[PDB]
Model the fold of this input.
Amino acid sequence: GEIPRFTQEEYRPPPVSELAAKGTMVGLISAAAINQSIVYSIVSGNEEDKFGINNITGVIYVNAPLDYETRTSYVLRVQADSLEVVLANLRVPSKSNTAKVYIEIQDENDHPPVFQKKFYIGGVSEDARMFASVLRVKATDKDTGNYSAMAYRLIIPPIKEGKEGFVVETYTGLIKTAMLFHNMRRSYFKFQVIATDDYGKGLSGKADVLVSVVNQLDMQVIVSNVPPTLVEKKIEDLTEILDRYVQEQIPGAKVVVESIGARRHGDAFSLEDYTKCDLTVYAIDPQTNRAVDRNELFKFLDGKLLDINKDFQPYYGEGGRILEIRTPEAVTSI
Amino acid sequence: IPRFTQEEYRPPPVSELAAKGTMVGLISAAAINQSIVYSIVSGNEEDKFGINNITGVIYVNAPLDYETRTSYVLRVQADSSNTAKVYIEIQDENDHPPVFQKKFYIGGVSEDARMFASVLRVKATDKDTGNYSAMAYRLIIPPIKEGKEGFVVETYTGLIKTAMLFHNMRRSYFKFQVIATDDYGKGLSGKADVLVSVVNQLDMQVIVSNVPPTLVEKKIEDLTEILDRYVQEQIPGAKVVVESIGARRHGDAFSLEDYTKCDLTVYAIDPQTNRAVDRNELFKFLDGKLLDINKDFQPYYGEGGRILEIRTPEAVT
Ligand SMILES: [Ca+2]
Ligand SMILES: [Ca+2]
Ligand SMILES: [Ca+2]
Ligand SMILES: [Ca+2]
Ligand SMILES: [Ca+2]
Ligand SMILES: [Ca+2]
Done:
């Protein structure tokens, strides 16, 4: 009785599609023992019952639905047994031997892109420079590598005279201006952003976008006793805090930062104090597609200054404060 | 027949900086009433490991290097014979400092740059993996009057942005350093120098092209690199800087806009003077080479695409 000898010490067949139908071949197991037939079985690592083996041919096949997102790898032990020979002149025992089979599941593209928000709200000022950042979008999905790697594009209604309105950076999701908005205050643009995985060759998802056009008549200046570099470094967290206070008055409103600068003061606001900060903001109301009235915005922030200062404390440091809210100086200078 | 404690061994990863004699793992087999001796029978061609034939302790025998080889598969043998596989993985250590892609970055700002306007993007890399080549960036800027910070850098992206206004500072400049530190700021460091020079409209020229500004903007990095080559054959190390990309302006006082065509406003900084190249010289370098520049722009602009002219922006009309 020869102990069965596999063709390989271990098996590493090619990856198996997570969308493989039942009966799909995974790979071949082969062993021989001189003058004896061989039978194949699976002895361990097949607890989930995802594979079977044809006990005569040694073909490992898919037995049940697979899912890369539940399990990526399997390590099976297959066993080969020679069959007994009990004849008048030959008596050969059954003998067994095992071998490891490393099976890897191949990720397929079975999850479409999902945007982190269904509705993105932004704004642009009348004096925004060409290619100024408006907002950044992001879609993800549960697939791996290329199958959740996004290409972004915009679907925007026609604009006359070769103007495109906005563009999106194809791989980063950054939406930027593509025209000037002089004299367009109170206009607004509604459009869609599409994410397509496999860098634009796979599945797609979408989100809506509103960009409202404002100018200084829509804005308020938050004056803080900390440098503009601190405010700018933390601006995402600060804006999220301000959104909460505006949103308890105007549901779904989005606060937008126009600029962050030194505190301006003195005659004609001509002096700059870099130890302090002027943060110019507005808010867009998705109910109107336009900016919140700047006097209402003043009331929402000025009325809550103590609470806002408390929420800013971890960012500004203790004794960091909003000093005041004021109307932009170029407006009042009229 | 000697029976191992395990069918195969997968000990923990071994530091690529492991000293000789460092333990990798233990191999153990028993055969009743008989002593056991251990050897390494295969996969140790490079001689990186040894085994104590009595204790079964596998140890580091020579210098390792994750950047040359990450994995080893040894076959160990126990005699009183039988064998077993040992899968050894090398752990990447942080032994390459950050290296900036350029040693000297040159940029500019206009007198009317808005606060936190993008200036330029830096990037350092190194041969380590994962966290050990993942960069945190910071700036070291010589003192500026009135406590001004000058510029900031986005900690993980390398984008350098303005942090003050530059009104009336034309022909002033800032020399400073950017530091990259791997392991997100807790590991090794490298640096590069940065020059940012201050200009205004008196330093600029407008490249007028027969393609939309959206096309120019998409390709701006390659276009700027082509323009650098033409300026650099006249002024060594000069850097072309893009001030803006817009519709082609025309009509009275250049008040009208044509979005089918493009005005690309540029200037150049000369690292010899730390200041802008004279705008009339810049005009000669570009206008004199328009045919050659148009040939190099062809793959970007597409069929029939060209620079139409260079014009000088003027405040008084
Ligand atoms: Ca799946
Ligand atoms: Ca998948
Ligand atoms: Ca996908
Ligand atoms: Ca190394
Ligand atoms: Ca390393
Ligand atoms: Ca490193």
Summary: The first strand of chain B starts at residue 3 and ends at 4. The first helix of chain B runs from residue 182 to 185.
